[PDB]
Design a protein around this ligand. Structure first.
Ligand SMILES: *[C@@H]1O[C@H](CO[C@@H]2O[C@@H](C)[C@@H](O)[C@@H](O)[C@@H]2O)[C@@H](O[C@@H]2O[C@H](CO)[C@@H](O[C@@H]3O[C@H](CO[C@H]4O[C@H](CO)[C@@H](O)[C@H](O)[C@@H]4O)[C@@H](O)[C@H](O)[C@@H]3O)[C@H](O)[C@H]2NC(C)=O)[C@H](O)[C@H]1NC(C)=O
Ligand SMILES: CC(=O)N[C@H]1[C@@H](O)[C@H](O)[C@@H](CO)O[C@@H]1O
Ligand SMILES: CC(=O)N[C@H]1[C@@H](O)[C@H](O)[C@@H](CO)O[C@@H]1O
Ligand SMILES: [Ca+2]
Ligand SMILES: [Ca+2]
Ligand SMILES: [Ca+2]
Lengths: 216, 212, 217
C-alpha cells in the first residue's frame, strides 16, 4: 500500500528503532516479513542472510535456495526469489558483516547489488566496492550464475558446490563462500567454510555473518 | 486465513517461527511452526532448550501455558486440546542429547481431551523412532501437576519426579522434568525418555509437535 | 484502533496472551509501540524495557541512542528513554529487576513505584519503596538522579561516571548498580564497570542475564 512500509529504511524513518522482524511491501505490493538491522552503519538494512551458531544446514538444493530456509529465531537465507524481488530496480547497496570467534568485527560495502530472476539463474549484478575492513572478496564473483549441488552453473569442469559444500555465484571456484559449512574458526579443510579470502582467509570460518541491503 | 502450521507452509512460509493461526472454534493463536523437520509444517506445543524456564508448575499454569516465545515453553493444555481435538493430528518428538545425537518417536494420532476429562491422553500406534516407544505406556491416563494428583500411585509421582505428565505409576517419559544437563544421579526426575537415553540422562533439547 | 486495542502487557495477559513475547500496545498518546511482555515471572504481565543476555549488543552508547532506544527484538535492548517515560508518566507502575549469574542463580528485587521524567528533566528517576528481593536494594541509592551517558554528564561526580564505569544510568557518585555496563561475563578484575549490582554479586561480578520491567499496580 503506497502508504505502507516497503523497506527496512522506511520503517526506520517511521520510528521503529529496534532491530527485528517486520513485514514490508515489495515493489509488486505483496507482503513479506523480513529482518531489519536498525543498528549497523546508520541502520535501515534488510538482512537476507544470517549465520550465527551453526544450527541450520546451508548445504541445500536449488528449490530450497529459491524459496528460502532457516528460522526467524536464528540462521536463514531469505530465498533467491525474494532477494530478487527486493533488488529488482537495483538502486540498493550491500553490506557484509563478519564477526570472528574472538568477537572481532569486519565488513565490506558495495555501491549497488542486484540479483536477476530465475530465468537468468539469479545472476549477480554487483556495483563498485566502496570500502570495508574485510577487503573485497565479492567483486571477483560479478556477472555469474548462482549454483547449488543439484544445479551447476559455474566455470569449473567440476561441481563447485560439492567441492566447497555451499551455494553461491561460483566461478572457478570462489574467493568468498558465506554459505559454506559452519566450521568454527580455523579448519584444515580447504575453503569449504564461511570464508572471505581477503578477510580471515581460506582456512577460517567466521562466527557470525550477515548480508544486508538498503536503498542507496 | 490459515488454521495450522501445515497451511502456512502450503501458502509459502518456509521459515520456522511464530505465526498466528486460527483454531476451529476461532480464537486466534500465535504458535511456533517448525517448517524444517521431517517435511515441515509442525505446530510446536513444547520446547526445552537451555533450562531457562521453570517447568515444575501448578495446574492453572499448565492449563493456560507458560514460558517465552524467545525460549522454552508449554503451549498450555487448553490450547493443545483446542489444537488436536477436531480431525486427527499426528504426534512427533525430537530429542537431542548433550553429545548432539538426534532422536525421535512418532505416532499416528495424538489427542488430549478437555479439562473435564483431565486433559487425558489419547494416543495412536507408534509409527517409528530411534528414541523407541516411551509414551504408549502413558496412554489413557489423566494429566497430573504437583498440586493435582490424578496419578495411579498412592504417592505423588509429580513431586517424586518434579515434572508434569499423564503420570501413571509412574513414568517411562518425563519431558517436563527438571533441566538436569546430561547424566544425573537422581532417579528419573529429568527430561527423560526411557527407551532413549534412559532414566539418568536429561536431554539438551526436547520438542513436542503436531501436524494434520 | 488506539482505543479498542491493549495498553499494557498486563492488559494482554488479561486478554489471554499467556506466552512471553513481542506484542504491540498503545501509548497513552495513541502511538503504537512494539514491546516485550514477560508473561511468566511473578504473576506475569510485565513490560520489559531492558534486557541483557549474551553480550551481543553494544551498550556503551550516546544520549541520542539512549533517548530513542537500541538493540534487537531477537536479543538485548534498551527500549529508549522517551518510551520508558511514556510508559510511566502516569506514576503508578511497579519495577522488577531479574538477574541471573553464570551459576544459574536467580535473584530479583522489587520496588513499589518507578517513574522517569521527560528529557527536559533529564529522565529524572522517581523510585518508591523497596518491597523486597533476594538481590538487595541497589537502586534506592539512585533515587532523584538524572540519567547520564558518556557524552552527556548529568551526575553528581566531579568526573564522568558513564566513562569511568563504561555504561549509562541514573549515576550519582557514581553507582551501586550499573546494569547498562559492559558484558564482562562473571568475575572481572576491573572495578565496577560491568553489569553490576552491589548488594547482589558485588562490584566485580557481571551477571549473565539482566531484565528491568514494569507493571501497573
Ligand atoms: C532531588 O534533588 C534536588 C537537588 O538536585 C537538583 O535537582 C534535581 C531534580 C536534578 O536536576 C539534579 O541534577 C540537581 O542537582 C533536591 O533539591 C533540594 O532540596 C532541598 C530540600 O530537600 C532544598 O533545601 C532548601 O534550601 C533552601 C535554601 O534557600 C535556597 O537555596 C538555593 C540557593 O542557595 C536555591 O536553589 C533553593 O531553591 C532555595 O531557594 C530553603 O528553601 C530550605 O531551607 C531548604 O533547606 C534545596 O534548595 C534543593 N536544591 C536545589 C538545587 O534547588 C530535591 O529535594 C530532590 N528531590 C527529592 C524528592 O528528593
Ligand atoms: C537437504 C535438501 O535441500 N534436500 C531436500 C529436498 O529438496 C529433496 O527433494 C529431498 C529428496 O527427494 O531431500 C530433502 O527433503
Ligand atoms: C552508541 C553511539 O552513539 N556511539 C557510537 C559512535 O558514535 C562512537 O564514536 C563509538 C565510540 O568509539 O561507539 C559507537 O560506534
Ligand atoms: Ca561444472
Ligand atoms: Ca495418586
Ligand atoms: Ca560530572
Amino acid at each position: 500500500c503506497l502508504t505502507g512500509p516497503r523497506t527496512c529504511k522506511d520503517l526506520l524513518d517511521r520510528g521503529h528503532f529496534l532491530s527485528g522482524w517486520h513485514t514490508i511491501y515489495l515493489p509488486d505490493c505483496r507482503p513479506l516479513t523480513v529482518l531489519c538491522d536498525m543498528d549497523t552503519d546508520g541502520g535501515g538494512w534488510t538482512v537476507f542472510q544470517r549465520r550465527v551458531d551453526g544450527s541450520v544446514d546451508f548445504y541445500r538444493d536449488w528449490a530450497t535456495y529459491k524459496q528460502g530456509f532457516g528460522s526467524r529465531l536464528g540462521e536463514f537465507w531469505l530465498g533467491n526469489d525474494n532477494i530478487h524481488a527486493l533488488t529488482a530496480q537495483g538502486t540498493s547497496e550491500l553490506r557484509t558483516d563478519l564477526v570472528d570467534f574472538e568477537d572481532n568485527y569486519q565488513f565490506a560495502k558495495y555501491r549497488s547489488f542486484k540479483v536477476a530472476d530465475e530465468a537468468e539463474k539469479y545472476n549477480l549484478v554487483l556495483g563498485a566496492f566502496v570500502e570495508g575492513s574485510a577487503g573485497d572478496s565479492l567483486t571477483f564473483h560479478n556477472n555469474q550464475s548462482f549454483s547449488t549441488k543439484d544445479q551447476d552453473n559455474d566455470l569449473n569442469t567440476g561441481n563447485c558446490a560439492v567441492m566447497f559444500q555451499g551455494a553461491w555465484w561460483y566461478k572457478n571456484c570462489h574467493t568468498s563462500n558465506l554459505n559454506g559449512r559452519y566450521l568454527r574458526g580455523t579448519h584444515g579443510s580447504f575453503a569449504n567454510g564461511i570464508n572471505w579470502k581477503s578477510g580471515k582467509g581460506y582456512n577460517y570460518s567466521y562466527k557470525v555473518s550477515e548480508m544486508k541491503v538498503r536503498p542507496a
